[PDB]
Copies of this chain bind each other. A is one copy, B any other.
Amino acid sequence: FLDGIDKAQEEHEKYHSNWRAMASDFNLPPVVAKEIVASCDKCQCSPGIWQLDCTHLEGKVILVAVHVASGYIEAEVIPAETGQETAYFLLKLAGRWPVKTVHTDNGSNFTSTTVKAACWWAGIKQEFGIPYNPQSQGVIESMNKELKKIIGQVRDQAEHLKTAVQMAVFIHNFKRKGGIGGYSAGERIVDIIATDIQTKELQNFRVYYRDSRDPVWKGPAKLLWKGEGAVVIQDNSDIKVVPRRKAKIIRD
């Protein structure tokens, strides 16, 4: 495993990624894997949802996007805060992935005409203001701070801070694997989108829910699932989880 040890050490010389990742390069139990971090001086929901934000590191404007469900990053140093350039970058996000809804604030950096045209052409919905759960915004701001610490480290390696911003984007996409089972943002992204296509396909049995309180039976309800203790059904826009011994079964 000396080759694996050398490879993991080089990886930390380049990436300083999570020790959970480096356990893979070591191909060794965690006890040694902690040593690379210990010795390291700088160390020791719908798939179509995205959010856009901004930060002002070192007097420059950095606009960052995150896929909420997986900790993915898409970022670019923007020359100016004008809505025209944000429109171009939102065009990029929309082209590269099937993005359905975007959560930003009400500011003119997003309510400008160009952004509205971008959403109109690409087919994206946007929210303007405070989301119902600003803890997600707090999480992405914490991610912004972690990217900033990352930058405070990488800037030893990049002559231009913009390039270090990109370097961080990639480090967090792939090298910094963690959470659940130590997975990179790329892995979660890919798993989520494959799940999404299989769920489009998933989206011959109908049920007459037997409302014994009348007593009466409901009409041609659909069977969204036949669990073990209950049988979900949908009735127009309402989804009523019926009792498993009080649901008729019609085979179509």
| A152: chain B residues within 8 A (beta carbon) | 42
| Contact of B199 with A194 in the complex, beta carbons under 8 Å | no
When C-beta atoms are compared, the residue in chain B nearest to A44 turns out to be B208
Residue among B201, B204, B229, B239 making CB contact with A198, cutoff 8 Å: B204
Q: List 24 A-B contacts (CB under 8 A).
A: A14-B157, A16-B175, A18-B176, A29-B31, A31-B32, A42-B156, A45-B210, A45-B247, A70-B218, A91-B167, A95-B170, A105-B215, A128-B213, A135-B139, A136-B214, A136-B215, A179-B181, A180-B220, A191-B252, A194-B250, A195-B223, A195-B249, A228-B233, A229-B238
Residue among B17, B153, B198, B249 making CB contact with A16, cutoff 8 Å: B153
Copies in the complex: 6
Residue among B139, B195, B241 making CB contact with A250, cutoff 8 Å: B195
Instruction: Decide: A167 near B197, CB < 8 A? Known: A135-B138, A216-B135.
Output: no
| Contact of A224 with B223 in the complex, beta carbons under 8 Å | no
Residue A59 lies at the interface, judged by CB distance under 8 Å to chain B: no
When C-beta atoms are compared, the residue in chain B nearest to A171 turns out to be B15
| Contact of A226 with B245 in the complex, beta carbons under 8 Å | no
* Docked complex: A202-234 residues within 8 A CB-CB of B: 202-208, 210-220, 222-230, 232-234
Residue A28 lies at the interface, judged by CB distance under 8 Å to chain B: yes
| A239: chain B residues within 8 A (beta carbon) | 227-230
| Contact of B232 with A228 in the complex, beta carbons under 8 Å | yes
| Contact of A38 with B194 in the complex, beta carbons under 8 Å | no
| Contact of B181 with A180 in the complex, beta carbons under 8 Å | yes
Residue among B24, B138, B177, B181 making CB contact with A138, cutoff 8 Å: B138
Residue among B88, B187, B205 making CB contact with A195, cutoff 8 Å: B205
Residue A186 lies at the interface, judged by CB distance under 8 Å to chain B: yes
Instruction: Decide: A251 near B181, CB < 8 A? Known: A138-B139, A204-B27, A225-B227.
Output: no
Measured CB to CB, the closest approach of chain B to A31, in angstroms, equals 5
Instruction: Decide: A95 near B68, CB < 8 A? Known: A29-B31, A138-B134, A194-B204.
Output: no
Measured CB to CB, the closest approach of chain B to A98, in angstroms, equals 6
Residue A52 lies at the interface, judged by CB distance under 8 Å to chain B: no
| A181: chain B residues within 8 A (beta carbon) | 69-71, 179-180, 188, 198, 201, 220
| Contact of B198 with A205 in the complex, beta carbons under 8 Å | yes
Residue A25 lies at the interface, judged by CB distance under 8 Å to chain B: yes
| A38: chain B residues within 8 A (beta carbon) | 250
